[PDB]
């Protein structure tokens, strides 16, 4: 998955 933290 992308990861819930990847955009930070």
């Amino acid at each position: 998955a992308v990861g819930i933290g990847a955009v930070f």
Partner: antibody, heavy 118, light 113 residues
Framework: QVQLLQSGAELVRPGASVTLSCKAS????????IHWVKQTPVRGLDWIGA????????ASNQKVKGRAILTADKSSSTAYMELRSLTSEDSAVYYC???????????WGTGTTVTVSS | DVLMTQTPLSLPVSLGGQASISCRSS???????????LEWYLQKPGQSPKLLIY???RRFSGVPDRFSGSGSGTDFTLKISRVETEDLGVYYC?????????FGGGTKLEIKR
Amino acid sequence: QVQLLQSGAELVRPGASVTLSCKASGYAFSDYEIHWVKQTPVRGLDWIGAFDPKSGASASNQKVKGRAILTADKSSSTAYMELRSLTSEDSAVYYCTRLRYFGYFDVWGTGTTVTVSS
Amino acid sequence: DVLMTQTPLSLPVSLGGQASISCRSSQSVVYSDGDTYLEWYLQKPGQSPKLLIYKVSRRFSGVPDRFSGSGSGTDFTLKISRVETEDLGVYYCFQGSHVPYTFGGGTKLEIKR
């Protein structure tokens, strides 16, 4: 030797809470999110939510919102999920699993069998 | 929220044959970075789930060539060729593109011998 250790079983009363723990070893704890997956025979696999130790972010699914609290203790490499106001619908096997950004669920815990019963 | 609908619920296949499992997302699961984070997991009796396919068609390390994933956008398909006895279990698709992530409902492979 990456591994994720969970307690084997928790018996909990209806209306009480349970605390699930996921103790990681064999890797750098902050480099991986911990995700929580509920398994039952008929409803299958159910992504419950996640905690990212690097950014500190958390998320959870719509159904469990308001009842689930996801945290992590970096010093002891342990992620936690607390679930409150349990009913028999919450009885299930709960797995933890790890996720690097843009990666996949490559390593899993062996699962905690939660039984909600008096 | 993004709904993953997997068919069929149970799949008989003769040993040495080929099984086809399909999974359809309710919305697109292409991520802004261009990739589609669609994964296939297998749960064998008495074990934890295990990763088979990530990124619609790429094979996790150790996963034989007989497993091949494909699809696009809305419609995805996992193909098991030359089925062996060890392939028994419940196969699940999974989208990891849009929070909240979601699993398909599962397909239980049934081996005919």
